Design a protein around this nucleic acid. Sequence first.
DNA 1: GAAACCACCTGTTTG
DNA 2: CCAAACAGGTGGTTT
Lengths: 102, 109
Amino acid sequence: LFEKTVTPSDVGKLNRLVIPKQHAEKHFPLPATKGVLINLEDRTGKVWRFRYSYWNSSQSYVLTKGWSRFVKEKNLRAGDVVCFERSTGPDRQLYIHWKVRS
Amino acid sequence: RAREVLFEKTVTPSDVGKLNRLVIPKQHAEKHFPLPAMTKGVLINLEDRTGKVWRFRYSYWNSSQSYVLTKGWSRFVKEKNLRAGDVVCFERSTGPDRQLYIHWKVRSS
DNA sequence: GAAACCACCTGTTTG
DNA sequence: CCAAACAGGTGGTTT
């Protein structure tokens, strides 16, 4: 469960979303590379597959593959908010949803 | 001297610019720095007149078909305040280590 | 070919 | 103050 106000770069041709490292280390641990594949679900019940990775050059956690399709379907914009949630029960499943400028 | 100067270039304004890269003339590039022979790219260690050793990455950018120095060039430019129209002279010592050497000269515009 | 993807790089900003 | 983090970039490769 963490939320980010998305930057212009987040929703542009850079095809990447930067996760703040506090939240990345707290809620999404990485094996310690090419990275892992992560499955989330939106309110429509569609399940999105993203690639979660670490860039050691910039020391930053980023979603790359699959983020742009999310941006385009949801018509994300700079200033909107993206909220990551997890299952209440043992299903262990992650959910993604988006609100707009509080 | 103990040093042999290899080549020099009067820096374009983009060499000191936000592009953070020094275009190296292909004529002068294939001559002393052959990239297939590794002189992806390679890291080169060049020492200045102040004694500071500077590490740059030397590669060939197919997009511009340019031989270029790219990583650390901005630091050199910022510390030396390299400006468009100044000159960069690359040199090599005739020693067993054959160390490479760099420093800049003055001239306007 | 175009768009996305990939692994690097850096200048500002800031606790 | 300054190392860290990150918003904004690059060239090259795969889809």
